Amino acid sequence: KIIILGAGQVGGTLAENLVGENNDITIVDNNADRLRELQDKYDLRVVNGHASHPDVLHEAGAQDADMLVAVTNTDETNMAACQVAFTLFNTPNRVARIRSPEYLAEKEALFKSGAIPVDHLIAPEELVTSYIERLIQYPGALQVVSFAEQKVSLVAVKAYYGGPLVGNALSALREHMPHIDTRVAAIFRQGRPIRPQGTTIIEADDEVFFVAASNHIRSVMSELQRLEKPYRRIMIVGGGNIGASLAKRLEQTYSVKLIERDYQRAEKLSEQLENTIVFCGDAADQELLTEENIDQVDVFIALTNEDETNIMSAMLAKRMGAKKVMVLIQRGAYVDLVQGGVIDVAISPQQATISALLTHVRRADIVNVSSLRRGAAEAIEAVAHGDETTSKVVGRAIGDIKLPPGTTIGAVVRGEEVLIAHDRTVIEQDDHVVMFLVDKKYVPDVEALFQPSPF
Amino acid sequence: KIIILGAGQVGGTLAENLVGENNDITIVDNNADRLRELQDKYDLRVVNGHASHPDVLHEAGAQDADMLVAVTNTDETNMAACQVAFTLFNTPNRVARIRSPEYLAEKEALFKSGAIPVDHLIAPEELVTSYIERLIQYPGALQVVSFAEQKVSLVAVKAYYGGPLVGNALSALREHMPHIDTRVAAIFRQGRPIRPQGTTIIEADDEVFFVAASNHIRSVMSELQRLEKPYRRIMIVGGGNIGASLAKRLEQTYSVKLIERDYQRAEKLSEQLENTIVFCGDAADQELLTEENIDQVDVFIALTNEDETNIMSAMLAKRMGAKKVMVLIQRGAYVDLVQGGVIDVAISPQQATISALLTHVRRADIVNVSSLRRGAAEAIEAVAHGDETTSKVVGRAIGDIKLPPGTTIGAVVRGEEVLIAHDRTVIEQDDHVVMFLVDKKYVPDVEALFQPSPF
Amino acid sequence: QFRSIIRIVGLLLALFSVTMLAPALVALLYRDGAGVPFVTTFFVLLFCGAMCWFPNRRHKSRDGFLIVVLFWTVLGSAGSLPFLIADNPNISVTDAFFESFSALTTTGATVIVGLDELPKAILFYRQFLQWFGGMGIIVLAVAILPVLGMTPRIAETAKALWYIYLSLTIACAVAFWLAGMTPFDAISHSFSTIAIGGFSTHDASMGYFDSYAINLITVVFLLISACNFTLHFAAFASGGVHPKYYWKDPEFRAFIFIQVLLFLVCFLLLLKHHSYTSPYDAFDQALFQTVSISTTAGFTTTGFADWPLFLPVLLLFSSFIGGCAGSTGGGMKVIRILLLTLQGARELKRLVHPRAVYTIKVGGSALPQRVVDAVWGFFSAYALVFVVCMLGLIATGMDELSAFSAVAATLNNLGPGLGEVALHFGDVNDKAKWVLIVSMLFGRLEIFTLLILLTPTFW
Amino acid sequence: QFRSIIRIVGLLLALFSVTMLAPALVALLYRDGAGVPFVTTFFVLLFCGAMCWFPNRRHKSRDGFLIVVLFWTVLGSAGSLPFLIADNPNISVTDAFFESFSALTTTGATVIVGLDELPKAILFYRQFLQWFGGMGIIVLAVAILPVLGMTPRIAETAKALWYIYLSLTIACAVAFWLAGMTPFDAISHSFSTIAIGGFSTHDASMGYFDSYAINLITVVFLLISACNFTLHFAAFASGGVHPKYYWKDPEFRAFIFIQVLLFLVCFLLLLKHHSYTSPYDAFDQALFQTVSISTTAGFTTTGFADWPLFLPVLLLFSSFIGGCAGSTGGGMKVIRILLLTLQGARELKRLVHPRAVYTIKVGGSALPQRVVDAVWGFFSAYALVFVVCMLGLIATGMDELSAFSAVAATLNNLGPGLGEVALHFGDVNDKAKWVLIVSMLFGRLEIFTLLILLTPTFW
Numbered sequence A, B: 001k002i003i004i005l006g007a008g009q010v011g012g013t014l015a016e017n018l019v020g021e022n023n024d025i026t027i028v029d030n031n032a033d034r035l036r037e038l039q040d041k042y043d044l045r046v047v048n049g050h051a052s053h054p055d056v057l058h059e060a061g062a063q064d065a066d067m068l069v070a071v072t073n074t075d076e077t078n079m080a081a082c083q084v085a086f087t088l089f090n091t092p093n094r095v096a097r098i099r100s101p102e103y104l105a106e107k108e109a110l111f112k113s114g115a116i117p118v119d120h121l122i123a124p125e126e127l128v129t130s131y132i133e134r135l136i137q138y139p140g141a142l143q144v145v146s147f148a149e150q151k152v153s154l155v156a157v158k159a160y161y162g163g164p165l166v167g168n169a170l171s172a173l174r175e176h177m178p179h180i181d182t183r184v185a186a187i188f189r190q191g192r193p194i195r196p197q198g199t200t201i202i203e204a205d206d207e208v209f210f211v212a213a214s215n216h217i218r219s220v221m222s223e224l225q226r227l228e229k230p231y232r233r234i235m236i237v238g239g240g241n242i243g244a245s246l247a248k249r250l251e252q253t254y255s256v257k258l259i260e261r262d263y264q265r266a267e268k269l270s271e272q273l274e275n276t277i278v279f280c281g282d283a284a285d286q287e288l289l290t291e292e293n294i295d296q297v298d299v300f301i302a303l304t305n306e307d308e309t310n311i312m313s314a315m316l317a318k319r320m321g322a323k324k325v326m327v328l329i330q331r332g333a334y335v336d337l338v339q340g341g342v343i344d345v346a347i348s349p350q351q352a353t354i355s356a357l358l359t360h361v362r363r364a365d366i367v368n369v370s371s372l373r374r375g376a377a378e379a380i381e382a383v384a385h386g387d388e389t390t391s392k393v394v395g396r397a398i399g400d401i402k403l404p405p406g407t408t409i410g411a412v413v414r415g416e417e418v419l420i421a422h423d424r425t426v427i428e429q430d431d432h433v434v435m436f437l438v439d440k441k442y443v444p445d446v447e448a449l450f451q452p453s454p455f
Numbered sequence C, D: 001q002f003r004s005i006i007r008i009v010g011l012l013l014a015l016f017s018v019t020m021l022a023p024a025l026v027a028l029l030y031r032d033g034a035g036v037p038f039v040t041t042f043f044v045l046l047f048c049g050a051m052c053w054f055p056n057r058r059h060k061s062r063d064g065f066l067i068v069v070l071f072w073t074v075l076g077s078a079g080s081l082p083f084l085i086a087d088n089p090n091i092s093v094t095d096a097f098f099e100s101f102s103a104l105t106t107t108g109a110t111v112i113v114g115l116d117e118l119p120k121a122i123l124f125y126r127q128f129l130q131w132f133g134g135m136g137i138i139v140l141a142v143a144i145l146p147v148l149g150m151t152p153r154i155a156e157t158a159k160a161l162w163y164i165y166l167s168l169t170i171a172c173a174v175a176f177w178l179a180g181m182t183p184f185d186a187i188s189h190s191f192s193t194i195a196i197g198g199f200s201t202h203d204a205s206m207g208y209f210d211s212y213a214i215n216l217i218t219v220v221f222l223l224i225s226a227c228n229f230t231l232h233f234a235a236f237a238s239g240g241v242h243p244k245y246y247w248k249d250p251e252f253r254a255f256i257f258i259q260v261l262l263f264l265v266c267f268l269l270l271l272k273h274h275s276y277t278s279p280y281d282a283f284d285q286a287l288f289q290t291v292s293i294s295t296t297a298g299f300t301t302t303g304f305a306d307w308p309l310f311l312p313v314l315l316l317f318s319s320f321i322g323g324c325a326g327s328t329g330g331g332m333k334v335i336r337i338l339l340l341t342l343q344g345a346r347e348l349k350r351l352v353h354p355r356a357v358y359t360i361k362v363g364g365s366a367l368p369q370r371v372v373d374a375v376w377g378f379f380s381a382y383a384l385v386f387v388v389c390m391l392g393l394i395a396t397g398m399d400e401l402s403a404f405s406a407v408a409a410t411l412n413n414l415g416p417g418l419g420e421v422a423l424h425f426g427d428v429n430d431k432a433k434w435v436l437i438v439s440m441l442f443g444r445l446e447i448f449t450l451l452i453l454l455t456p457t458f459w
C-alpha cells in the first residue's frame, strides 16, 4: 500500500501516474484544498487531517504499507511527521520533500537516519527546479523527456538566427556526426508541423525534435553546446525562494538583473545578492524594460507567484527583443496553452520533479503512457501487448502499421538495447515503442491500435 | 418635517435630541446602518440607498418640508446632495457640512452672496476643536452647559495643586467677587459627593460645580483665567484629521509633541506640521512617555479612532504626571462610566454640538429636559406645569418640597431675569427652574414630582 | 421586567368593560335576555382593573411575548365570566371558557346548542368578541412583528387599520341588510364575516339566510378580508392611488391561484357525482364552502349530506393554507407556502446549474436567510404541535379521526371540524375541550409565542 | 455529452439479460411454469444490448440524471416482457409495465390476482426483480450523491454493501425456512423482506403464513434492512468494533423512537376498540403492521377488517417517514424529518438568544446550508408532485379518497394503498395506472432526477 501526504502542488501529479500496477494508492492531504483535491481525485481515498499527528497516520502505518511518500508544503512539519511515523509505526521506506533549502546543504546524521529524518530519499523543489540552469546552460534547448529506463531521450531544440543550425540542411546535420544514430521526429515551424526529409532549417522559429539513445542525445547536445555562442545576460522578474536561489546560482557566471515589486524584499535581496543588480518595479511596464536594455537581454525568466503575470511579462520581453523566454506555470491548462512560439519554455514545477523522479522508478507500462508537454503534439511510450500475431501491432513491421496521422515511431527499446526505428524492423512482444504524435487528439486512436481483442 | 442623511458619523446622534418637535420627524441614513440600526434604536421614519442620487431624496417630502440635515463625511458630495434636492424637490430650510476647509475658508464671501448652491446654513464637525482650545485656556474648566436659551450656565471646574482654589475656604471664594451671584451646586471629592457650604476645598482634584447667570459665569471664569498660570506643554496621541488641525491651531502658542503609530502618516505630519515635534510610536508604551517628559506635560489629549485606546493611554498619562487629561469618546456608555477623576474630560463630537444646539433649539420645555454629563450626576431644567395647587411644586417653597436625595436647585429663570433660589425662594414661578441631581437614577421621580395629577 | 405588565393588563380589561357595556345596552334595547350579567361583569372587570392597575411604574423583548400571551388568555377568561353568570345558556365553566375563547380567538367553534332561541345580547356579544379579536389579530400581526411572522408610523397605521376594518364591516352589514338580513343579524354577521370568525346567531350557520346574494357577499368580503390589510392601506392612503397594486404582491397571486384551483376542483368533483341537480347550485355551494373553509372563516351553508366524502376532507386540509400573512385568521399563511414553492423551484433550478447563486426573490426583493429559516422552523413547530394535540385528544378517549379533525379545526382557527365533533363541540370530552382551547391559543400565537413560554431556558 | 449513453444502456440491459437465466433455471428444476418467455427475453435483450454497443467516450454531471432515469425506465420496459409473453398470468401490456416497474422500483404494488396458483418461475422472477432493484437502490444512492438526502473507495464499498446485502438475505431466508417455510418461499420472501419491497408469492402476502415467529423475523430483518447500510459497514469492517455504533447515529435514534411510538400508539388504539380477542395478538399484529408499513415495506398479515380506520390511515401517513437514508425504499427519509425537528428546535432556541450563533448539529458535525436548503426543496417537490399526481388520478375518474391513498402508496414505494385499492390494482383505470407508474417512478430518484427532465432550463 502506497501513501502520499500534503497539500503540495506536486502531490496531485504523483497521484495520477502512479495509479494501478497492483499497488493501492492513498493520499492524505491537509485540511482545505486537500479536502477538495482529495474529493476531486480518481481512485484512492483521502482522510482529511494534519499530516503529522499519529491518529491520521495509523490507517497507513501498520497495515502493510508499501512506501511512505511524505511530500508537504512545509518542511519543518514534514520532518516531525516522518519521525512520528517511524518511531510510532514501522513505515520501513519513506520519502520526504523539504525545500529548506539550508537543510539540504547538510544531510549530517539526521539524514543518516539515526534521528529527526529517518528517510531513504528526499526530494527538493529547488534543486530539481534548478534544471532551469541546465536549460540556460544548453543554448537553444526547449525540452527533454525520457522513455523506457534512461536509454532513449527526446529533445526539443530551437534554431536561432545566427546560430549554427540556420541555413544548414538536415543532411549536413546528419553528416556532421556520422557516428550518431538519431531520428528527427517532427519539426514545428511557425506553429504548423512539417515533414522532414533533408530540408533547410528556417532560422526564425524551427523547433527540431531528436529521438535517440541518451548517450547520443547527450553527445549531440554537447556538440551544440560547443558550437552555439553561450548566453551572456539574464533577466529575472521574481523575488521568490526560487528566483533568489537562481540569481545566487547564476550571478557568478552571468550578469543578472532581477526585478521585484515588494520594496522590502528588493532591499533584502540587494543585501543578500551581490553581483546581481536588483530592481524594484512591476514586470509589466515597458519604461523599465526598455530603460534596462530589454533589446539586449538574452534569457528572460518569469518566476512570479501569479502565472498570468509571468506569461504576459515574458511575452512582452519576447516582443521587445529577448532571445529566450521562460515562465513558471502552476496550472497545466496554461502550460498546455502558451508554450509555443511566443513563450519558448514553461516550467511546471510539478512536472520538473515528476518527470525526473518518476521516469527512473518502475518504468510504468500501459498500452499508452504519455509524457505531457505543450503543443498539439504529444509523446507516448506504447507497449506491445498481446500474442505474436494476436495483437494488431505485434509481429508486424513498422512500415505495415496503420498509424494515426502525424504519428511517427522514433525508436524501439528492446530490453537493454536501443534501435532507431525503420520500416525494415518488426515489432516484437513486450517491446517498448517510442512514438510521437503531432495532434494529441489521436492519443486514444493509438491505444485502440495497441489494445488487442479483449480476452 | 425633519430629514437627515446617511450614513452619518454624528448624524445618528443628531437624530436623537432633535426628535422633540411635535411635528413629524424622519431620519434616512445611508443604507443598512441607517435602517437596521436606525429602526432598532429609533422612532418614526426613513430610508435607504447611496447618496446622493435624487431617487432617495424625494422620500423627505419637500412640499414645504421644513428640516433638511445633510450629514456627510465628504463635502464635495454634500454640496451636490443638497442641490439636487432644491432643484428637483425644492426643500426650503437647508443645512450643510463642509470640512474642505478651503471652501470653509472662502465660504463666508462665497456662501453669503446667494449665488452659492442651496446651503446657506452651515455646520462644521471640526469646530469642536475651538472648545478644546477653550479647555486648554481657563485652566481647570472641565465643562459648561447653558439652559433657558443660554440664560443660565452650569460649570464644572477642577482645583489643581498650586492653583488659586487650594486651601482657600469657600467663604473666601464667595468674598473674592462680592458682585457675582453664583450658586455652588455640589462638590465631588474622590468620587463621593459632599455638602459644600462653608467647607475648605481640598486641593487634590476637587470638582466644584457653579450655577449662575451667563454674565456671572463669564466673569468668574475670566477671573480664574487671570489667577491660574496658563498651560505651556501639550501632548497629543492622534494623527487624525482632528488631531492634525488641533496641532495646527495650537503649535503657535504652545509647545506640542504629537504621537502616531503609522510611520507614513508621521512623515506626512512632520512635513505639514512646523513647530510641532511629531513622533512615531504607540501611545501605550511608557518607554516613550517617560523618555519624553510625561511627568512634565500639562495637557494630554487623546484623539485616536478607538475609544478604549484613548481611555487607557490617557489614564496612563494621568498616572504618570499629566495635569489635565482629555479623550475622544465615540460611545456615550463610556463617557458615563469612566470619566470622573481619572479622565478629566472627553470630547464627544455628538454632545459637543448637541449641548449648544439643543439650548439654541426651541423649545426644550418638557416635564424633564436632561442635559447629561459624566458620572452619576445630573443637571436638569424642570418645568413647573399646572395651576396654583394642581402641581406638587407650584406656589410652594423649595425648603418645603420633598426633593429626591442630593437634589439641589441652583437657579430659577423667569423671563429675562435669573434668581439664585436662596432660602425661602420667593418666586413668580409658572416659570423655569434649574436643578442638579447627584444620582441620575432619580430623574424620573423629579418628573413625577413635576408631573401634575393626570386628568 | 416582569410585574411591570400589570398596568397594561388593567388598561386592557378596563377597555373590555366598556365593550361589555355596548352589548348590554343592545340587550336592554331588544327587551329580551339577561343583561344583568353583562352589567355585573362590567363592574367586576373594572374592579379587577383598578385592583390590578394600582399605580403605574417605570416604562422599562421577552416582555412583549408575555404581553401578547397574557392579552389573549386574560381577555378569554374575562369573556368566560359573562357566560358563567347568566342563566339562559346554563353551561359548565369549561363550556363557557370554550365559547369565550373561540369567539375571541376567532376560531368558529361553538359548544352551545339552540342559538336561534337565545338572548339577543349573548349572541350579539359573541359576534362582537369575534370583531374584537379580529382587530387584535390585525393590529398585532401588522404592528407587532418582532419574531412574529420600511417602517411607517406605528399608531397612525394602528388606527388606519381600524378605519379599514370599520369601512368594511359597515359596507358589509349594509349589503347584508340590502340582501334581506335582519339589521341585528346583519351587524352580527358582518362582525364575523369580516373578522373571518365563523360565528352566527343561528344553529345552521349561513344556512338560515339561504340567499344567493348573501352567499356571494360572504364570499366577496371573505376574499377581501383574507387579503393583506397592509395592501388595502395602499388603496386607502392618498385616495385610490391604484386598484391593481394587489396583483403585484405575489402572495395575492398565490392566494388567488389557490382559491381558484380549490374552487374549480371542488366544483368539477361536485358535478361528476351529480351531487346537486342544478349547476347554479353546485357553483354557489362550492364557491361559498371553499372560500369559507380555505380562508379559515368557518361558515357552512350545507351539511355535506350529498357531498362526496372527499370534498369535506379536501376543505379541511385546505384550511391549513389559510389567509394572507397580514389578513385576519390563518393557519400557516399562504406566503409561507409561496416561499416553500419558491424554495423547491430554487433547488430544482440549482440542480441543473450547481455553481450558481440563486436567491428567493419575492416581488423583486431578496429574502434574508433568517426569515426563510424562520418559515420552516414554523412549519416544524406547527407539525410537532399538531401531533401532540392529536395524541392528547386521543388520550382523553376522543375519537381518533374526530381528534384529527378537531385539531385541524382549532389549530387553524377554522373552527368547524368534520366527524364526531361535526357541528357542535358540546359533547366533546372535557379534558379534550381544554386541550382544544390550548390548541386554538397555539394557532393564534403563530405556534411560537406560546411554545417559547414552556421552555425552561426562557425563565 | 448527450447521445453517448446508448453504450451504457446496452451494457446494462445485457447484464439484465444475464439475470433472466436464474429464474428460467428455477423453472426447469420444477419443470412447470412456462419458462419459454424467460429464454426468449434473454435472447431479445442480449440482442438489444449488442444492437447498440459502439464504444465512444470511455474513461480510465447533467448526464448522470439521464443515466439513472434510463436505469429505471429502460430496465422496467425490458423487465415487462416476461409478463407480456407468458400465458398463465395473461395480463395486458399496461398491467405488465405496472407489475415490472413495481417489482423493480421496490413498490409492493401488484396487478395480478391469484398468485398462489401461478407458475413458480414467474413469481420467483418477481421477487428477483425486487432483489435486483434492491441492490440498485443502495448502489445508486450511496455512490451517486448530487442529490444526497475518512472516506472509503467507491468500488470496495460498492461490494462491501453487496456482501452485507447477501449475508442478510441468506441469514433471513435461513430463519424463514427454519420457521416452517418452503425453501422456495423462503428465498422469495427474503428477496422481498431485505429489499423492503412488499412482494409475496401469495394473495395474502405475509398473512398466508400464520406463525408468530415469521412475523417477528420479518419485523427484525425489516428494522435491520431499513437501517443505514453505511452504518452496517461499520459492523462489517474488521468485525465488531462496537455493537452500539448504531445508537450513536442520531438517525438511528430517531428511527427507533418513531417505530416504538407508532407501535405503542397503534397497540393501545388496537385495545381501546377490542379489535383482537387476545392482547398477545394485538401486540403481534400491531408490531408487524407498524414495522411493515412505517418502514415502507408493504407486507400485510390482516385485512384491517376489525381494525379501526384510524390505524390504517395512520399507517399510510406514517409511510411518508420511511426507511433511513442509506437503505432501500422510503419516501422522505427519517433524516429529513430529524432535520425538520432540529430546525424547529433551533428556531425555538432563538427565543431569548437572538444574537447567538446556533447551527444544525447532527452527531457533532455541522451541516452546510446548501444541504439543509436541499432537504426543504425536497419537501416542496414532494408536496407539489403529490398534489399533481392525486389530481391526475382524480381527473381519470378514479375515486378521490382512493386516489389519495394510491398516490401515497406509490410515491412512497409502499405500495399497498387503503381504500378501493387494497389489495389489487386490477380494476384501476388504465390511464390512472400509467399515472401511477409515473408516480412510483417519482418515488425513486428522490423526486428531483425526474422532475428536472420536465424543466425547460434543462434542455
Ligand SMILES: Nc1ncnc2c1ncn2[C@@H]1O[C@H](COP(=O)(O)OP(=O)(O)O)[C@@H](O)[C@H]1O
Pocket: A237, A238, A239, A240, A241, A259, A260, A261, A262, A265, A281, A282, A283, A284, A303, A304, A305, A306, A309
Ligand atoms: N507584477 C509583479 N512584478 C514583480 N514582482 C511580483 C509581481 N507580482 C508578484 N511579485 C512578487 O513575487 C515575489 C515572490 O513570490 P512569492 O509570493 O514569494 O511566491 P510563494 O507564494 O510561492 O512564496 C513576491 O515578492 C511578490 O511581490
Ligand SMILES: Nc1ncnc2c1ncn2[C@@H]1O[C@H](COP(=O)(O)OP(=O)(O)O)[C@@H](O)[C@H]1O
Pocket: B237, B238, B239, B240, B241, B242, B259, B260, B261, B262, B265, B281, B282, B283, B284, B303, B304, B305, B309
Ligand atoms: N496608540 C494608537 N493606536 C491606534 N491608533 C493610533 C495610536 N496612536 C495614534 N494613532 C492614530 O490615530 C489616527 C486616527 O485618526 P483618525 O483621523 O480618526 O483616523 P481616521 O482618519 O481613520 O478617522 C491614526 O493615525 C492612528 O494611527
